[PDB]
Amino acid sequence: QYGFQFQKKTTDGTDLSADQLKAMQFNLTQYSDNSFQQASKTNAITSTDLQALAPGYYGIQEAAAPTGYQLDGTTYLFQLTSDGQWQYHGTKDNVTSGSVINGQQTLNPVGDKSDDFTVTGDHQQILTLTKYDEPKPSMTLRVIKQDNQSQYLAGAAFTLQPSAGEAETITSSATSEGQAFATKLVADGTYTMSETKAPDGYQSNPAKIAIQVATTGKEATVTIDGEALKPSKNGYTLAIDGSTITLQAINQPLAILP
Numbered sequence: 386q387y388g389f390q391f392q393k394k395t396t397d398g399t400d401l402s403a404d405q406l407k408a409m410q411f412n413l414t415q416y417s418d419n420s421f422q423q424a425s426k427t428n429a430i431t432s433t434d435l436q437a438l439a440p441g442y443y444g445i446q447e448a449a450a451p452t453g454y455q456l457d458g459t460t461y462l463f464q465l466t467s468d469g470q471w472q473y474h475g476t477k478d479n480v481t482s483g484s485v486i487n488g489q490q491t492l493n494p495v496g497d498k499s500d501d502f503t504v505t506g507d508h509q510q511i512l513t514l515t516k517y518d519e520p521k522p523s524m525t526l527r528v529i530k531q532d533n534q535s536q537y538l539a540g541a542a543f544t545l546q547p548s549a550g551e552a553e554t555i556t557s558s559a560t561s562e563g564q565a566f567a568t569k570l571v572a573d574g575t576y577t578m579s580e581t582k583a584p585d586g587y588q589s590n591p592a593k594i595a596i597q598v599a600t601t602g603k604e605a606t607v608t609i610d611g612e613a614l615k616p617s618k619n620g621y622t623l624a625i626d627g628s629t630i631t632l633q634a635i636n637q638p639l640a641i642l643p
Contacts, residue, residue, distance in 0.1 A: 387465055388435045388506075389413070390513040391445065396498045397520035401451060406432055410449035411516075414460070416442035421462055421480055435511075440465040444477065445514055453571060454518035459493055461514060463502060471504055471512050486512070495519045522602025524570035525629040530557030530584060532636050537561070541636065542581030548574055554581045563631070570630075572602030578609075578632070587636030592619050594632070603627070 391411060395401060415426040419442050430436055446460035462474035464483060473490050475481035484490060492500035498517035505511045530541035537559035545553040545566045555564040570576065578594035595613075597606030607613055607630070609621055616623040622633035 386437055387439070387469065387510045388437050389430075389443075389445075390435050390511065391430070391432070392513060392515050393432050393451075394498065394515050394517045395454065395520065396496045396517050397454075399520060401453070405451040407452055408449050409451040410447065412444075412446050412448045414444045414446075416444060416462075418442060419464070419474070419483065421474070421477065438465050440467050442474075447516060450518050452573070453521045455521050457493075457495055457516065457518075461492060461500070461502070463512060465512075469508070469510055471502070471509075473502060521572050523572070523628070524598060524602070524604075525565055526570050526578070526596065527563055527565035527629055527631040528555065528557055528578075529561070529563030529631065529633040530559065530636065531633055532587065533638060537563075538584050538587065538636055541584035541587070541634070543632075543634070544577075544579055544581035546577040546579070547571075548576070557584070557634075563633075565629070565631075570596065570598055572598045572604070573600045574598050580634070583639075584636060586639050588639055590620065590634065590636070592621070594621065596630070605630070 411430050412427060413430050414424045417423045417425040421442055442464055444460040444462050447456055450456045460477045464472040471486045472483040473486050474483040486502050486504055489501045489503045495517045496519055500516055502512050502514045505513055528543045530538040532538050539557055539559040541557035542554050545568055553566050553568045555566050558564050576596045580590045583589040592610040594609040595607055598604050616625055620635040624631045
């Protein structure tokens with residue numbers, strides 16, 4: 386009994402299923418003519434969902450990809466026929482003549498991975514289109530531990546406290562390189578950086594770094610203690626070389642009493 390389906394896939398290789406169907410949305414339209422100019426019925430359909438189709442003209446599109454991968458607004462067109470053959474007519478960009486889908490027609494690709502309508506089923510009466518999602522733009526946060534004397538310092542913890550998931554503590558290297566955290570910085574995610582511990586005999590820095598990522602995935606929303614700055618306030622320095630916000634921290638030799 387003729388039906389349709391879509392498995393969702395990640396180029397990152399990232400198996401995100403926790404909050405994938407979270408905001409993931411897929412619209413199937415049932416177009417009236419092969420022209421696809423006019424849409425008679427339309428309705429949502431999910432990863433786990435198989436939906437009977439009478440013969441007709443039809444588009445499949447994503448209107449909401451899961452949080453942290455950008456939408457491919459592309460509507461892929463196809464057709465089921467009175468006989469039982471599945472064809473393929475392209476995108477509402479450029480509407481193809483309609484080529485019978487025998488086994489598979491490769492589709493528009495996102496990165497290395499490429500989408501394809503693939504015809505399973507005993508009587509080959511089941512179209513499944515795999516939609517690859519491209520992992521959304523990401524940030525990298527790197528830290529450089531620096532004393533009063535411009536001398537690199539190590540054993541200086543700096544904790545990355547995210548909104549959710551494991552909080553991460555790097556220990557600073559005494560390197561011009563420094564240290565970047567094990568946890569890349571999500572778009573539309575919110576985080577706190579604080580000196581986890583003073584490096585032994587230097588003064589603690591109590592003030593907390595706030596970093597908020599825009600839905601864009603390059604965003605500069607950061608307000609340590611009370612306020613925010615243009616990229617050294619509070620001995621905290623920020624440097625942006627695109628993908629990476631880097632922080633350089635000057636410690637204070639603990640004030641000593643006779």
